[PDB]
Design a protein around this ligand. Structure first.
Ligand code: DCP
Ligand SMILES: OC[C@H]1O[C@@](CO)(O[C@H]2O[C@H](CO)[C@@H](O)[C@H](O)[C@H]2O)[C@@H](O)[C@@H]1O
Ligand code: MG
Lengths: 553, 406
DNA sequence: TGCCCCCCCTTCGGTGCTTTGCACCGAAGGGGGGG
């Protein structure tokens, strides 16, 4: 049926008119699919015949529903969508089963022909004009317009969800201890009533939906576990993902690897330890989706590791609001982190991973802090609170980081957990110059227009060096000059530069970088005992710096 | 009443900013608050055909246990028409910063007695989120002058002055400044006699519909140079770099006769004696750094900018300026929250006190340059916010080339 | 040959800097998943 809910007023964008796009050819199996849908949507009043005074059109097609023996009608409203007003979408996220409480009685219902039970603004219907082909050659076609929400229109999902929300609200208020998870036309209904009273409330919910035109076919009325919901399986005490099948291939195209990583990312919500760094490395610098990419040795290993993890059966548990949330993080290498969120040990609510490189130069402590921030946000979304953290970093390491890093940084309540590899600072610059250490005055200049430069140093022990550099930059020659001083110095060194840029990077104490040259500087910094790094202004005649700047020019 | 016609600035559209996640206790409060406002007609339930949105969250003061709804209308206020162009702005009184004590009162509720132009209401939409996205968001828009909107003090202008004019006659030497939803009221009365005419002011207001500031101890911290008996090459290098930067701010500061103390390729720890002409140069530079800079005046047509630096051990330096190197105010914020541990809390508190000082002194908040990663700030700042206003800010990572402000 | 949402990984183009490349950021392209 068609809901008697008031329609939602909708506009085209200012200046714009309607679509005018001739129809294309379809199979006979799909023409008879739609004529059966379309003379029958007309009898129930979902569409109406029109003709030549309405100048608009938009092409139409059908795909097979995932239930087989049923077809989904779709119109290619790409043109109308562009000239239709913007909407504020009210679907703000996706419910997750780790946010659910244990319930004594559970039911899953789905509304039938959801979109077609919601009417469309009277004044907007004429822009939904289309035509049914019937073998193209035999007849020009029959023109209709939508009286209800069409599948493929930009505004249909939001107008349905908002309509469903208004219809549900009387029932929610009248029944505050029945949880209704509402995603599109899919309703999860849990309660702590014995199944008798529960099914009374269920049939009363369905009858309330029916008065407002929303059927709930028995076909999609789940009454017993395991419930199929949002891609998962809900058992009474636990939940699982529906089975994940990864591609297996002799030869891999870029698109195959793209699909592989996406599935692994989906699996990572419950399968701990998933890694995709080396498989995704294969997608860089590629230029086509059909390009055959051979797997590197490292990608084969990573895929094999994931395949071992996935052959194991896993489950999540549900949320107990009387117990604390606990998040534990482990380091995996190459900027990869994996985490589990639980309340009782060895009983995961869910898992996840963090593996983004923010910045050209960073360190493990920064990335641990980012992983904490992602977990904190995800916990607010799912449970409305942040968890207590268990982290593989020691209090002294963190304390040394937030006193010598100049940016404000923080991490909540956390308990140190000894799960190597531990997160650590890989070097620390001295706060003061070092007695007995050699002093290097470093400098490098480059020619903006020529690409050619030089890096070099002068030394309080009389040492000097200049290396010529080609196809370089100003900032590179300054980094290179610091590279030389670290290369030719002993275990303890004092370095004076005039590049704020180079000071900025190194003083942040990075341990990884997208720059090979910065990576070289980092490996040298880690092998040293003590390093004091000092800045001076250039071209003000200051001893050491002036002499080296002479030598580089 | 009659609405006042309101416009966005030419060629600008309304705000389109996504709601961010909220805790359980903040969502419940917003649901409690907004259902009451809907019942009183102050807001209306809307749907997705309104394409605008503004984030909403909630704050609770340490002293005031009740939750306060806070709509982040920064985007909308930027796009709203000027009201100084239409002559309905609020003049700032110079005397407020002179007063012994200033108390801040939240009078945003008075706005809810005046309706908003029906054609402007759609720009005020906001969306309450759902825990675990159990439901779609719930959308409202205002029917009255919104709290946090810069047009509300301007439209309510004529009315607030008439509510306040008996108090203003009765008490000539107390000065009252409206800024957004806040009344900043200052006087010279005793530390606790001042508080009682606060309470009389509030009853007169409660008739129709924070903590005590103390400006005469908002001391400036100048640039100061180290004092030692002995100086290493590194000390002189750092001191020459510190004054070479400061010469962009001050006039006639010189390094020529400390620089050549370092002629030659010297070790960083070698102790160089001080010439008489280097003590000449230093003791004098101490004096230019002593007293403030000549030629620096506030311009109300230009923006205020604020820079902050973490210095450690709980302390935070800041500078407020409009043109670079012409500081209207230099300062040092110190915490005493207890444990010394939380950088984000200290910086959030520092921003509120610095912005409070600009309101008292100049009448508007500065645009902050914050020494913090964007996503570290956004993970935590609403936890510590206590003001009904929100300043504009941006995120910088400037390493300290020199420790200029210590 | 459709629509809306969330997630991750990669690429690209805009912005500001007392710059001449560099680092940051948001959008857009692919993938996963949901209805
Ligand atoms: N590929 C898809 C799947 C779903 N939907 C939207 C329109 C649907 O009406 C609604 C609900 O999805 P369903 O699978 O439940 O389809 P229907 O409710 O329309 O029909 P049925 O009775 O088979 O459930 O979500 C869509 O636009 N495109
Ligand atoms: O923190 C920046 C972040 O906040 C948003 C809103 O969530 O923008 C707000 O803050 C900006 C900085 O002051 C303002 O310019 C803007 O008007 C205000 O809405 C996001 O847009 C932005 O990513
Ligand atoms: Mg359905």
């Amino acid at each position: 049926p068609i809901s008697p809910i008031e329609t939602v007023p909708v506009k085209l964008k200012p200046g714009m008119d309607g679509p005018k796009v001739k129809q294309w050819p379809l199979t006979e199996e799909k023409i008879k699919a739609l004529v059966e849908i379309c003379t029958e949507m007309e009898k129930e009043g979902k569409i109406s015949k029109i003709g030549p005074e309405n100048p608009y059109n938009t092409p139409v097609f059908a795909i097979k529903k995932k239930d087989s023996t049923k077809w989904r009608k779709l119109v290619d409203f790409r043109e109308l969508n562009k000239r239709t007003q913007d909407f504020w979408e009210v679907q703000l996220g996706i419910p997750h089963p780790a946010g659910l409480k244990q319930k004594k009685s559970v039911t899953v219902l789905d509304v039938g022909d959801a979109f077609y039970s919601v009417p469309l603004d009277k004044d907007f219907r004429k822009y939904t004009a289309f035509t049914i082909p019937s073998i193209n050659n035999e007849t020009p076609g029959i023109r209709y317009q939508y009286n209800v929400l069409p599948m493929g229109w930009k505004g249909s999902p939001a107008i349905f969800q908002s309509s469903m929300t208004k219809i549900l609200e009387p029932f929610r208020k009248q029944n505050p201890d029945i949880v209704i998870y509402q995603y599109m036309d899919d309703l999860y209904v849990g309660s702590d009533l014995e199944i008798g009273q529960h099914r009374t409330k269920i049939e009363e919910l369905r009858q309330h939906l029916l008065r407002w035109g929303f059927t709930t076919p028995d076909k999609k009325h789940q009454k017993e576990p395991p419930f199929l919901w949002m891609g998962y399986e809900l058992h009474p005490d636990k939940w699982t993902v529906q089975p994940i099948v990864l591609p297996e291939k002799d030869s891999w195209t870029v698109n195959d690897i793209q699909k592989l990583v996406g599935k692994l990312n989906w699996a990572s919500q419950i399968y701990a330890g998933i890694k995709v760094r080396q498989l995704s490395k294969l997608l860089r610098g590629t230029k086509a989706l059909t390009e055959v990419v051979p797997l590197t040795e490292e990608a084969e290993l990573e895929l094999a590791e994931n395949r071992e993890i996935l052959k194991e059966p896993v489950h999540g548990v549900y949320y107990d609001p009387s117990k604390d949330l606990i998040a534990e993080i482990q380091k995996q290498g190459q900027g990869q982190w994996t985490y589990q969120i639980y309340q009782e040990p060895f009983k995961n609510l869910k898992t996840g991973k963090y593996a983004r490189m923010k910045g050209a130069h960073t360190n493990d402590v920064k990335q641990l802090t980012e992983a904490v921030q992602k977990i904190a946000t995800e916990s607010i979304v799912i449970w409305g609170k942040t968890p207590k953290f268990k982290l593989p970093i020691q209090k002294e390491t963190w304390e040394a980081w937030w006193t010598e890093y100049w940016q404000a940084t923080w991490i909540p309540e956390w308990e140190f957990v000894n799960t190597p590899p531990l997160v650590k600072l890989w070097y620390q610059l001295e706060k003061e110059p070092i007695i007995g250490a050699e002093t290097f005055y470093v400098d490098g200049a480059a020619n903006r227009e020529t690409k050619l430069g030089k890096a070099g140093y002068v030394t309080d022990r009389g040492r000097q060096k200049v290396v010529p550099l080609t196809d370089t930059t100003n900032q590179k020659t300054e980094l290179q000059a610091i590279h030389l001083a670290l290369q030719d110095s002993g275990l303890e060194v004092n370095i004076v530069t005039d590049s704020q840029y180079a000071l900025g990077i190194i003083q942040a104490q990075p341990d990884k970088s997208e720059s090979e040259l910065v990576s070289q500087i980092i490996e040298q910094l880690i092998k040293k005992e003590k390093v004091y790094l000092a800045w001076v202004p250039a071209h003000k005649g200051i001893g050491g710096n002036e002499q080296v700047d002479k030598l580089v020019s | 009443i009659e609405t006042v016609p309101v416009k966005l600035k030419p060629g600008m559209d309304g705000p389109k900013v996504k709601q961010w996640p909220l805790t359980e206790e903040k969502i419940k409060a917003l649901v409690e608050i907004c259902t009451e406002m809907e019942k009183e007609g102050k807001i209306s339930k809307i749907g997705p055909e309104n394409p605008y949105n503004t984030p909403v969250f909630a704050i609770k003061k340490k002293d005031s246990t009740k939750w306060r709804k806070l709509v982040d209308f920064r985007e909308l206020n930027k796009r709203t028409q000027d009201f100084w162009e239409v002559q309905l702005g609020i003049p700032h009184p110079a005397g407020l910063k002179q007063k012994k004590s200033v108390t801040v009162l939240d009078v945003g509720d008075a706005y809810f007695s005046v309706p908003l132009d029906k054609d402007f209401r759609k720009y005020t939409a906001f969306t309450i989120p759902s825990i675990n996205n159990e439901t779609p968001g719930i959308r409202y828009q205002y029917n009255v002058l919104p709290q946090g909107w810069k047009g509300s003090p301007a439209i309510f202008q004529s009315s607030m002055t008439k509510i306040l004019e008996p108090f203003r006659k009765q008490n000539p030497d107390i000065v009252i400044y409206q800024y957004m939803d806040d009344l900043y009221v200052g006087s010279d009365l005793e530390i606790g006699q001042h508080r009682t005419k606060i309470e009389e002011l509030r009853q007169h207001l409660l008739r129709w519909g924070g903590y005590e500031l103390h400006p005469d101890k908002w001391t400036v911290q100048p640039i100061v140079l180290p004092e030692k008996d002995s100086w290493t090459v590194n000390d002189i290098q750092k001191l020459v770099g510190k004054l070479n930067w400061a010469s962009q701010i001050y006039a006639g500061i010189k390094v020529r006769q400390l620089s050549k103390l370092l002629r030659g390729t010297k070790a960083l720890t070698e102790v160089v004696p001080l010439t008489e002409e280097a003590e000449l140069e230093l003791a004098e530079n101490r004096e230019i750094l002593k007293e403030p800079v000549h030629g620096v005046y506030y311009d109300p047509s230009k923006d205020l900018i604020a820079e902050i630096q973490k210095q450690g051990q709980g302390q935070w330096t800041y500078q407020i300026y409009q043109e670079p190197f012409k500081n209207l105010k230099t300062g040092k914020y110190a915490r005493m929250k207890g444990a010394h541990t939380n950088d984000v809390k200290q910086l959030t508190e520092a921003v509120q006190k610095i912005a409070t000082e600009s309101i008292v002194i100049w009448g508007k908040t500065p645009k902050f340059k914050l020494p913090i990663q964007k996503e570290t700030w956004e993970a935590w700042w609403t936890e510590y916010w206590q003001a009904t206003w929100i300043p504009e800010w941006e995120f910088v990572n400037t390493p300290p080339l020199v420790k200029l402000w210590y």
